[PDB]
Structure formats: structure tokens, C-alpha cells
Ligand binder design. Structure first.
Ligand SMILES: CCC(C)(C)C(=O)O[C@H]1C[C@@H](C)C=C2C=C[C@H](C)[C@H](CC[C@@H](O)C[C@@H](O)CC(=O)O)[C@H]21
Length: 400
């Protein structure tokens, strides 16, 4: 019901198209479908194609997550090691506990060092100011940078922690920090490392961080169009895109551009656990709960909060979930849908992905929306993909 649902959304003028790529571990069941049209900077229309270059936005986080785990395999990092030396900017952050009534900020020194595992699972304390009201309040009083100067990761994310390292959960720049950590410990750019360790083994050559400079890629950017002459990804994140315009260097949190076909090669290598990217036991460890007791309780409070629908990535409020290395982790079966220990996340409001090892299925579904982005419609469209792909998978299994 992707077919009729997506077409209805095209007819209303709220999306231009969609790219969907799903596969089992061996490529027996494969479903690839490009729907709709893209618009070129010239205004001319072209059918959506499976090798259109998409803005991944926070789907970047999974890829940065793999890159960090590869440095762990190399012995350049450990999951639980002290990062204070490699990233002193993180060690220097204090923990904001709240405000007095005259609205002055209470902070405390950090009780422990920040580790890679905390960065990868959003339990370090680094929080997006637009999601954490306490951090939103601090940003505004200790304001303002209308500097507009292009900022590196460490010049962009200068706020205190939202909670003692390891003891909470809040979505934030942990993978931008992890990406910077990967650059520092390898002595090269994040693009260089990923090209060599992730894209080359999979035969991927059509990928770049913001800003996209390559002419061949720019000619295939969905997001280079009259509504987005900057190729900022506005349609994917729903207004802006502010962080991209203001950054300098690679942002492992949200910066990558990639085709759906190339993104699913990465998903499938994890699903099949074929050693192309990581040793099997390291992949297995991604699909485990890595929040401790306090952090798990914080996670569940955020999932029950008004932001919870975003944080639940379409999963039901009755489904117990944790956070793995790479995204949300289901902790029980939903019969007919995600098996237990499905890893899932997404990008902006328009893109979502899952890796269901128990049921042997992975996929990405990426709506190409029309500004202004109808957020409630995106949620529905993503949900249609997440469930219709299981329907298609069952029908195929039944036909064998
Ligand atoms: C730039 C953030 C990034 C990774 C692109 C992103 O897509 O995370 C997604 C993935 C999804 C699973 C869960 C999410 C959790 C909360 C949000 C609604 C977030 C989307 C935020 C984005 O819509 C607005 C930001 O761009 C704010 C800004 O413009 O600075 C959203």
C-alpha cells in the first residue's frame, strides 16, 4: 500500500517521490522502487531513479557508527576507554542539572569520563539544543553566535552536558564528536576513512559529505533544485538547513549524501554479517542494549515525552526498546513486523531504515518531500513503508 499511499501524496503535491530499497541477507527477496519525479535546478523534471543521490541526514549516524567500530577493531579506540585525551573539549564540559528560581544555572563537574560507547548511544550527555529544553535555555542566556563563521564540530557543539556521562539518554551530536574522534586518531578526514574502509569494499564511489562539490554527484542530487539551490537538504530535515550551511568539515551526525542502492549495501552487509565491514562478533555487539539502568530509564522518559514519536521511529509505545550501537533496538518480537533486536533509525522527517536480523530483512525508505514538509504526513508515509515492506516479504515467502 506504498503504491497507492505514495501516489496519493504525490497527487496532493506534498511529495515529489520516494526511493525504497529492501533486501534479505542473500538477496533472494529484493525490492527496489523509485517513485515520482525530481526537479533539476533548471526547473526541468526527471523521473525518480534508484541511483539518485539522496541526503541521508541522520542516516549518516549509522555509517559513522561503523567507522568508529572499525577504529575499535584497529586498536585505535575502545568502546569504554577514556576519551578525555583525544577530545579534551568533551572532558571540559560540565553537567547542567537545572536552574535556580532567579534562573541561574546549576552545573557540576563530570563524575566520570565520556567514552565512545556513550557517544554512539546518545548517553554521553551531549544533547541537541532544539530537543533539550534545559540546554535550549542555557544556549539562549549564554548567547549569541550570529558569528555565521563556518564552525568545526567542536566549535559548533559547545554546550554543557545534560546529565552525568552514562546516566541518561538524549539525542544529540555524539556521532559528530565520534566522527571527529575518528579523524583525530586516524590523522585523516572522515571521508577519507569511510571511502577506504566502508565504501571501497562495497564498490561505493558516489558519496560525499556536505558540501557536495563533485559535478557528477551534483547532477544527480535530488536536493539541488529551485526550492533548495544550496543543496542543503531542506526537504529532508523540514526547514533550513541551518547546520549544514554553518558547518566546516565533515559532520558524522548528519552530513552524508548517498544513493538508496548504496545505503542498502551497507545495511545488508550488517544483516548478512559477511565481514566486509566488521568482524561478526563486533556486528553482534551492535544489536545489544548498551544503556545502563539510569540511562535506560532516561531513554524511556524521552520515549514517553512529546518528542517520543520521533524517538520511537514508528515502534509501538507498548514495545520495549533499548538503544544499540547504531540506532533504536527493539527488545521483544512484534509478530508480523520487526523481530526482537531489530536496529532502526532514520534521517530528518522523511527517511527511515531498519535491520531485522531475526526475520532476515533490512531496508531504507526515503520520501522526497515538497517544502513546506507536512510532518504528520511523513510519519504516515514512513509507517506505510515500514509495514508494507513486511507484507511484500511475507507474500514472497509464501510464493516459494
Ligand atoms: C539533523 C538531525 C538528523 C540526524 C538529520 C535527523 O534527521 O534526526 C532525525 C532522525 C529520526 C530518527 C529522529 C529524530 C529525532 C528528533 C528530530 C525530529 C530529528 C530531526 C530533526 C530535524 O528535522 C531538524 C534538525 O535539522 C534541527 C536543525 O535544523 O538544526 C529526527
Amino acid at each position: 500500500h506504498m503504491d497507492t499511499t505514495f501516489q496519493a501524496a504525490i497527487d496532493t503535491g506534498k511529495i515529489n517521490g520516494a526511493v525504497v530499497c529492501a533486501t534479505d541477507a542473500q538477496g533472494h527477496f529484493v525490492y527496489n522502487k523509485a517513485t515520482g519525479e525530481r526537479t533539476l535546478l533548471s526547473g526541468e523534471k526527471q523521473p525518480q531513479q534508484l541511483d539518485d543521490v539522496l541526503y541521508l541526514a541522520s542516516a549518516t549516524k549509522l555509517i559513522t557508527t561503523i567507522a568508529a567500530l572499525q577504529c575499535v577493531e584497529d586498536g585505535l579506540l575502545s568502546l569504554d576507554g577514556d576519551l578525555s585525551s583525544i577530545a579534551p573539549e568533551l572532558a571540559a564540559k560540565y553537567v547542567l542539572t537545572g536552574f535556580t528560581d532567579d534562573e541561574s544555572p546549576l552545573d557540576d563537574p563530570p563524575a566520570r569520563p565520556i567514552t565512545l560507547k556513550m557517544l554512539l548511544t546518545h548517553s554521553s550527555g551531549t544533547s541537541y539544543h532544539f530537543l533539550d529544553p534545559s540546554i535550549a535555555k542555557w544556549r539562549a542566556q549564554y548567547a549569541n553566535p550570529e558569528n555565521e563563521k563556518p564552525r568545526l564540530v567542536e566549535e559548533m557543539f559547545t554546550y554543557p552536558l545534560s546529565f552525568q556521562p552514562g546516566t541518561g539518554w538524549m539525542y544529540g551530536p555524539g556521532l559528530d564528536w565520534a566522527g571527529r574522534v575518528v579523524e583525530r586518531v586516524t590523522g585523516g578526514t572522515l571521508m577519507e576513512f569511510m571511502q577506504k574502509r566502508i565504501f571501497d569494499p562495497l564498490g561505493i564511489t558516489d558519496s560525499q559529505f556536505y558540501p557536495v562539490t563533485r559535478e557528477d554527484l551534483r547532477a544527480r542530487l535530488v536536493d539541488l533544485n529551485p526550492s533548495d539551490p544550496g543543496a542543503l537538504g531542506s526537504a529532508v530535515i523540514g526547514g533550513g538547513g541551518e547546520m549544514n550551511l554553518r558547518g566546516r568539515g565533515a559532520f558524522g551526525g548528519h552530513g552524508l549524501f548517498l544513493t538508496g542502492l548504496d545505503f542498502v549495501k551497507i545495511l545488508r552487509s550488517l544483516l548478512a554479517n559477511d565481514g566486509m565491514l566488521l568482524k561478526p562478533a563486533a556486528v553482534d555487539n551492535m544489536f545489544q542494549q548498551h544503556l545502563g539502568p539510569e540511562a535506560a530509564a532516561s531513554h524511556r522518559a524521552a520515549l514517553a515525552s512529546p518528542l517520543g514519536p520521533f524517538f520511537r521511529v514508528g515502534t509501538d509505545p507498548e514495545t520495549k526498546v533499548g538503544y544499540g550501537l547504531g540506532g533504536l533496538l527493539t527488545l521483544e518480537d512484534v509478530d508480523g513486523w520487526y523481530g526482537e533486536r531489530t536496529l532502526t533509525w532514520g534521517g530528518g522527517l522523511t527517511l527511515t531504515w531498519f535491520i531485522d536480523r531475526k526475520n532476515n530483512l533490512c531496508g531504507v525508505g526515503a520520501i522526497q518531500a515538497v517544502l513546506p514538509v507536512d510532518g504528520d504526513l511523513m510519519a504516515d508515509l514512513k509507517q506505510t513503508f515500514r509495514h508494507d515492506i513486511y507484507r511484500k516479504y511475507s507474500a514472497w515467502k509464501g510464493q516459494q
